[PDB]
Amino acid sequence: QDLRAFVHDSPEETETTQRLTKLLTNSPIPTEELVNNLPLFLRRHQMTDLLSMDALYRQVLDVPGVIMEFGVRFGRHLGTFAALRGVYEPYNPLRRIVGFDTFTPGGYPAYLKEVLDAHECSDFFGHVTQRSVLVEGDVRETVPRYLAENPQTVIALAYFDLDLYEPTKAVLEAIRPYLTKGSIVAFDELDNPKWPGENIAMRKVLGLDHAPLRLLPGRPAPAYLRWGD
Amino acid sequence: QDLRAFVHDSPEETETTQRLTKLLTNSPIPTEELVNNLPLFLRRHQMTDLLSMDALYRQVLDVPGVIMEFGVRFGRHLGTFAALRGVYEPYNPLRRIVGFDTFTPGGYPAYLKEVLDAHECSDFFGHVTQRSVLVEGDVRETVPRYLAENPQTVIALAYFDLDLYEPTKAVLEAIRPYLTKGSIVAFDELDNPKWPGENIAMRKVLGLDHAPLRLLPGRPAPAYLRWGD
Amino acid sequence: QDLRAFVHDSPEETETTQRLTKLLTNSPIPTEELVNNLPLFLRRHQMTDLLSMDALYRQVLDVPGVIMEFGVRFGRHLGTFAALRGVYEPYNPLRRIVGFDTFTVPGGYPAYLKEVLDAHECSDFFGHVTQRSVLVEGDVRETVPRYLAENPQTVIALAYFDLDLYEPTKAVLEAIRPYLTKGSIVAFDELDNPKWPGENIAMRKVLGLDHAPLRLLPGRPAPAYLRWGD
Amino acid sequence: QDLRAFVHDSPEETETTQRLTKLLTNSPIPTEELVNNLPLFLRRHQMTDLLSMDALYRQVLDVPGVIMEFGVRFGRHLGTFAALRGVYEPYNPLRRIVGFDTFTVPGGYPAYLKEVLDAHECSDFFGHVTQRSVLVEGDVRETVPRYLAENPQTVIALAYFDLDLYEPTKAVLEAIRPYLTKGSIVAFDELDNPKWPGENIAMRKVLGLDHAPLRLLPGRPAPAYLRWGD
Amino acid sequence: QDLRAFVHDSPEETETTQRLTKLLTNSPIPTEELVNNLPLFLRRHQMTDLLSMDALYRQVLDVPGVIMEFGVRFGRHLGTFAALRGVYEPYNPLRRIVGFDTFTQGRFAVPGGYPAYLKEVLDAHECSDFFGHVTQRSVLVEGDVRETVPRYLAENPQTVIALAYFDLDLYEPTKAVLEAIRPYLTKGSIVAFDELDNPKWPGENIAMRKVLGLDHAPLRLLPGRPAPAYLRWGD
Amino acid sequence: QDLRAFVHDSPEETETTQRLTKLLTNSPIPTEELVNNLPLFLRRHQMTDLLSMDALYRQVLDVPGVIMEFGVRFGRHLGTFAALRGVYEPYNPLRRIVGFDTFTVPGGYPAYLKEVLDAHECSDFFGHVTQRSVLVEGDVRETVPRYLAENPQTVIALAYFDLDLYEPTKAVLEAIRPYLTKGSIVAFDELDNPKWPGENIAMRKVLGLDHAPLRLLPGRPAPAYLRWGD
Amino acid sequence: QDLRAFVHDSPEETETTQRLTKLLTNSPIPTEELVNNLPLFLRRHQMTDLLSMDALYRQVLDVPGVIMEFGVRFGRHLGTFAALRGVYEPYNPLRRIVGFDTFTVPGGYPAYLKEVLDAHECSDFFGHVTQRSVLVEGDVRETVPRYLAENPQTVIALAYFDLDLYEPTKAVLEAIRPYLTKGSIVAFDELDNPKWPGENIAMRKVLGLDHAPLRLLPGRPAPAYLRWGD
Fold this sequence. Notes:
Chain E: Residues 1-16 are annotated as: Disordered. Chain E: GO terms for molecular function: O-methyltransferase activity. Chain E: InterPro entries: SAM-dependent_MTases_sf (IPR029063), TylF_MeTrfase (IPR008884). This is part of a larger assembly, with seven copies of chain A. The first copy, chain A, has seven helices and seven strands. Chain A is an alpha/beta fold. Chain A has one domain: Vaccinia Virus protein VP39 (Rossmann fold, 3-Layer(aba) Sandwich), CATH 3.40.50.150. In chain A, strand 4, helix 6 and strand 5 form a beta-alpha-beta unit. The F-G interface holds F 61-66, 88-95, 126, 128-131, 151-155, 178-184, 228-229 and G 2, 4-8, 10, 48, 191-194, 196-197, 199-201, 204, 208-210, 212-222, 224, 230.
């Protein structure tokens, strides 16, 4: 197997990343102004991800329910969604953001919860708790349990970043009764040769023509569908 | 004069900013992954600014010419534009980004140029130089000089953050022959009680009904117009 | 359980509400002019409810039939619908407004609410036609089927659910279904609210959440509403 | 039963109607010019009905077939359709207008109504083609199936139901179905009216209220109409 | 059989083709500049084919997956797709281009056969792609599609097919490939045919009617052009 | 001056160009089939120019008149226009293509280019009409006014500027203006290019950059084009 | 001068025309059915002209006034307009068709052409109103101003120019201008044709080519037409 046939960073993309890291860590900007200048260090590749999450969020502003991410890494998308919920939905305390991951750095979920709490403390409904929830464990156990604990659930946006067949299949099967027509289901690596399990699960549970799978033009991921279309 | 009648941060907005600063500077994320997770620390207020710059940029993707910012602070908008030019215009080496400021930390323009060079080194046209330019000095001298040196100039997007009457007036007068119908002219504080000089200049040079001034809904700034409309 | 995870008023929202109450009841406006100035006392949160009911009504102006609310509280929505019917439908005497509740509020509250609705109706263009507002007291599991049996002409243009609980919500969904047309609106006051999961459980039991497209009016957590047949 | 809960004329609507009757029948307008000034005497309520029939007709200008009215009263809609066919379709001799009624009106009323329709048709571009207006006298349960058997070329573009009762509405809905296309309009004069529930009972029996989207013309309680196949 | 009832070149079309060939190979343009002036030699008929492929590509820019061509001739469409992928998708390394064919100077046989030359062509486009460091973004598969297409899909379970272009002529291969690709299409994928309604090659139509039916989805032309005939899956 | 601030080819773009040149000229494709496979050798950068010329042409299909190019290099755009005219306009013998250049390329290059254009034209539906392609050799400051004086029927649908310099660009803009209609396209190959500022200086002198809306095809630095009168 | 640079028929177009002439004049179709089968003999080129006139007429169906043709040849367009007026406007007796020509055609040709137009009009819905088709014989420089003086009610909805020459085109453009409204169509048969530059010279003299947007119907070299006021 030729590893070069998998997506990987060019030398220039690596150079850009390393330079921006160094300029962030050794910045003459006053430390208390760094979080007012983060776009200085946000290169094309990561800007694109932010714009894509914005695009998905904007498609469910007229859909009830919660946002769920299955596979969260360090929380990039969860921070994005917390900020965007401020931009678009000051008066919606029911738009819960739920992140599922095994999380295996230690004690990282506690840090990430501190980050999400910091966004939430200036929300208009910051007095309502449990608007951001991190669920630690294997999704084959935690997603059914979360849903059993939350029979009020409607899912407006479901973001899949699980990579593997068995967990992707189990979660697709579990979330289906909580979707409405217009709910968005999005995949981080549906058609990526490195991680074929997501496609295999999609074909097993639903079929690739169950609904129209779409790209945001110019961007290889995410692939996303509108339920019922 | 009651200073509370000017826009200022709420205690919660300050708390969010301070918390996110601390979580950025004391982060368990591996240092070389911070620039892959900047949305964790990008609160609503600053996300909104990014989305607004994206919106303005998207309105000039079918307009020739350069992007100019008059008054640049630490360069937040210049970094944003450098990344967005990657997202939208890999094959446009003529979309120069020009920032004008007195810049008065010392040697800061050199740092900011290092930042912009770091984005540019993975651009498709990264071999073409002078696609990002910082012009140091008073805009009443530097903007006419830049234009005299660049008679090829068309201005697609002009962003005003000068605050004061005399420099805003001088730059509006200087850039006018380089605009086309469809060029965007945007103001950071047109209708803000703290900085009335921008409005006074706009009314002197053009008139507030010269073209339709618009907001992005929900956002008090920028105010922007499409030339010729 | 943490009660802070349920929606509740901020201290600032409570303060606004208490202040506006005091200014309404201690007003230098002449008594006979208060009802010409009620927006002085209509705060954001309640203004939003009004605009939402107007948006739902405007979606059924080309749909025949009646408006039903299942769970009416003090009658806020029924008064809204009575005024909007005047705004949009002076010539439609068949747009009946039917409110169902146990009314368990002061005793004799239904008679007061009926007097309020009659006061709107006496200046309607069709104010001489009776029974254009109906309050039905009792358990919706009996009263909604009984109302429909008594009214076989029924078509339902707008059905608004504020019943909270599984059994009543399930029984009413099942009963109203033969009286909906494609384009009828079915709306829910607390479909996705952790405090009252029975509404969702009943919707998933009877129809399923993807039976039709559930929507929000952007920026507002409720109502959630669907257009039948879409 | 409270008869004021059925739609009925206000005193003012009665006054307008009686005054306009007097002014029509005692007019200083020369006799031969009265039929050039009928809008003087066409009040809101009746103008609304005319505008509604025009709206329904305009929706079937690109649909083949005939117009049928089941229950015709004195013929108001048939005259309306005869004139509108002149406005919109001078070159379409296949747009037959067929009215079905028992005519149980003065005696010999159908012959009068036929004289009226012939008077419109004698200035039609295709006035030399006969049987473009047909009055079919009898119980629709017998006459509509017989008409369709005699006319196997039939396509129905617009079907207007004003039969009031369950058994005839059901029988005619069942008989006309094979002659509709997608886009044909089916319209009801009293689908949701408390006075005449049989029309609704029949619609629910034969098709279901959500078989197709039932619509109003906004602001008007009737007709309720659907586009076949939507 | 009257062979004039099959589509063939007019004398004037032949004349144009022969003249432009002469002017291409005997040109005062410096040889190193010819690839900057190819439109001088690209006549209407061939320009039309290029515009048609651009129209099909533009319809799948918001559809995930790969581009496949079944029956590739000298590779005209594969080169077009490689250039167009540059135009529209610099940042999409997952848009693989896969050409299937049996592949069965001027006088010396090419070592490795025509596929070795055509791979050289596609490599030449890819070395200036923004994602030119990711390999296997263009793939040629030699052999009988009845075997090679199922094998390729078995080997590539991540596949989604955004654009499937059929130029196989015959019933049995067209039927087999239609059957194999179906689980990999989404609603909005484009399936296109080079000779669906062509008297010379009825097997393509026979296979379409057998597997799907001509009214499975709406078959369309680009107006004014007899081919391709194409459908949007699920419409 | 830093020559790196002017647009120039990356090493990878040079490599692609050289490789495709070698594969074109050492091809196992039969000689008489090369012109059926030129897209094998048409790289991104040149494909983009073709799609841009097609987009401009498609915007003048409902505009009368001719196509003019001022500065033609080896004739790339003229060949493109000749093929596109076949694609879109088999029945329009009045869509003349006029190329103006000094032709200072090998000597006798205009005769070769004319032979190329004639080869396209001999299979056009109107190939029997002559002078549908015209090459005008000389200084545009004399030749464009002379062409227009000789051709008072002229309407200009598309004017494409690739003259680089101030004086020729200014003279041609001034000359063509009476032959444009609202909707004519005026396009520039290097309006905002630091290497050739005279084009911009001339546009600002004659018309001004806001005389009409200058546009890009998104993602492409050139051409910049305006629709006259907008 | 190279006469092959003017538009002219190909050998194949001549062959089609001559063959269809023979088949029209030696047809086994019964004589009285020939005028029911004329499309058998209506080739592409002439069909295109008919479709163009239909397109221009359809653009003025919501514009008051008359149709004028300046230069009428044997009357092809006048017959086309007479038929299209039947298709689209049975109830508009004010849509006069006026043809201006010197008729310098066989002798007495205008009387023949009038018989043809009367033959269309005798089956028009308003066939009893005379002077709905008018042929005005003479030099347009005299006849058009005289016609307008005799007809101060004139509004011009569509003006079709086929005069070829500068002086008559200029004079008629100047005379008709006060009778156009915004939306009136002005159309030219040879505005950009090298054979007849005088039409363009006149347009540039009186109005300028950018006075309004000149358009083609795509794929057709003529007519070129503008919507007044755009």
